[PDB]
Design a protein around this ligand. Structure first.
Ligand SMILES: [Ca+2]
Ligand SMILES: [Ca+2]
Lengths: 172, 172, 172, 172, 172, 172
């Protein structure tokens, strides 16, 4: 029993660890996407920068989660960070849609965590998720949807010119 | 179905569209009050300025609700903006009292909305309402309450001097 | 009867209240268009930004009209603000063509209002309309005409790439 | 009843009045600790400084609570501020453990207050607690837990050298 | 016995502790007074602002007093801070009068304390009272007395306008 | 076959992927150590900062490796990032020694990679490792050895004061 623990359910704790790993996984996915667009045969520096930044963001969420854990007296338990589903992300459009899912998936997990926080009557954990994740996710998912829409309407992925311009005008 | 929609109930979506219209309405009411005090037979520039500002506020609130709708993949449907209940707001004290009532109504509407978001377990929608409207409405109610009270004690509406000085000292 | 009223015919008064409402209406159509381009499935930020500005400009025109009413002793009477024709504006080209028409209509109304002022021999009303409205109308129409022409030549609406580039190069 | 009152339960109101007194009590407890370390036979200026600041923090919370009460239409009702249960706090480590308990009790109390807020469907009062008190208490309990862990691991309270160096290196 | 203690009579010590509780009490009276004018049905921010300041002042005095105690070798013993008389101060003029009284009582107590220090031939405790409390009280009294005069003369509390203007012109 | 590939052996390529994962693993270890010292029962902010920074460094090496891979035409293949051996790092000293090994181990891998680069006569890959890793490793291993030595000589881990001071004077 931690001296600072208070109103922090066991389910909550395990769930945060569950969440820390998921965030790290998302991060790992993005890192993968990033360096795919860095390949001499894909060559889209901005898509590359975009994802690398997205990757670093997920790592911050992960670290803020670990912070939260220690903050409420819970104990951190890391677990293997599973590698990404793919190695080759096909195209800019395909990668964007993959991210759209990744985010919607992490959002699903966040909402479930919030539901558990509510059921366990842990307002502090609820506010933490409300203020630091929920709203960011909606923004991110919205951002991705938009990029996907633009890429689709520009003629991607068949059109290489489309992905090129998008790289320059939206991600640049 | 929107590619970014997730955990967004149709009722909530319809409720947001309702709120949007209510905000546009409130904004119309304040616009009306504003120019009332701009009449050559009322001539209270600061009351006029105060309400014009309030008007622009409610319109900013409307646009933020519309932004919300899109962010969560809902679809906006505008409806007529009914006209204010009057064209003559009588006195400054009277318009202040009406605003107090208009705000408490709008707030009432937001409490409905927030309660709905809860029943439909939509934490994002609840935090949006919390962190953006519920807190601002309370401050607003309190402000109007204060103005209403000051106007009454100074002698309004009976005393024309009262409203003149409140115009200069509180609204100027 | 206002103490400042002088040579302000009643038909003029009513014509102006009607214009105030027409202006507010235009502001509404524009607000509607702005947030259409904000939809995750349209996603043209500069179009959204562009029309949101025109909405603010039209609203600002309404208010000057309201200021004018009070300047010459007239009395303001507001009416409901009818909802825009559509909820979906299709494409950039379509919204542009729609906006061009809207503009020509308001102008159409201003011109009649000026023909009335001329008939009622009210030089002040004529000058207020010439200086503050007719010029901006000619300008806005030419601006909108040009936009429409560009979009057509680029291949819009069929060319999604056309609307993306226009969004970035002309509206950005 | 207040003209601004809206969705503010009687029980909630009384709960605040209660919390207001609790915060003042905390403030008093810290003020006592503060000057205990200011005694020539204790002599730890930074521990003193630390608690004197915590003391002012707690009073500020009380004052913000009183603001809330009038902000929603409630009515402040002050009660005697009961003196702390101790006059001599033995040591820096002992005092820290005391503060830790005092904070977990204030937090325990805010959580009950937040519960009540939810049982009464009062979302405003809910965000007010989450945003201005819930995270603050968590961060504070963590800080105190840390301080207690360091002091113990340093040799306190047996070692006078230990509390001295903590006074200089952690609180200075 | 304290190693720093010198020429500090046990009665002086007990009187200093009594004074500490008294300054803290006064402090609590002003705090109560302050938020009374923050009420939506009183609404006089500068009165509220004014008394809040006087409140923080009283606490600074209480704190300096506690510092004196330790400086001389005495030992602090806190007592309950008894709640103020009223919960409703009726009017600014009334609150101002109550304050004038509070100050004259605190003063009476200080003068007593000074004579005690004199009979106990403790010049240090005499000069401390002279320099840091006595002239401050005289000023406070004269200030409060002046405020009462203006409020009575402007026509308080019958005239709401009287207190409103005093709020703006003297306390603003 | 990549268009930019040239003098880049298959063994080399696979070895770099091998290395990328190792770097990411090291990074993961450090992240773990970092947040262990953030626990309310360990409480050494600087050891915490130290490792978190060390962690971010290993992630840069990882990313620079992925960069290298694409640079020479090789293809990146990520793999699960195995979790750290431990969850509880016992103490500051124990963590330092663990890092000393982690670094010596990563150094062993780097030297082997360099040997392979030499055998495959790939000077570019040799210089890359010589300039970007070999020298840094020697510095890091030296740094860790020193910290270990200091902690040992100060009385760590039995002495909690030792770890405390070290945290403040060397890591701060
Ligand atoms: Ca002209
Ligand atoms: Ca919240």
């Amino acid at each position: 029993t931690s001296q600072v623990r208070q109103n922090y359910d066991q389910d909550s704790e395990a769930a945060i660890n569950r969440q820390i790993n998921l965030e790290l996984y998302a991060s790992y996915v993005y890192l993968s996407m990033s360096y795919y667009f860095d390949r001499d045969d894909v060559a889209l520096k901005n898509f590359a920068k975009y994802f690398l930044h997205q990757s670093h963001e997920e790592r911050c969420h992960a670290e803020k989660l670990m912070k939260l854990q220690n903050q409420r007296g819970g104990r951190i338990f890391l677990q293997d960070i599973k590698k990404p589903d793919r190695d080759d992300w096909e195209s800019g459009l395909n990668a964007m849609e993959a991210a759209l899912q990744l985010e919607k998936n992490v959002n699903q997990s966040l909402l479930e965590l919030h539901k558990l926080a509510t059921d366990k009557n842990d307002p502090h954990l609820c506010d933490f998720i409300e203020t630091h994740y929920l709203n960011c996710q909606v923004c991110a998912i919205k951002c991705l949807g938009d990029h996907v829409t633009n890429l689709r309407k520009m003629g991607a992925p068949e059109s290489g010119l489309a992905e090129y311009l998008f790289d320059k005008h939206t991600l640049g």
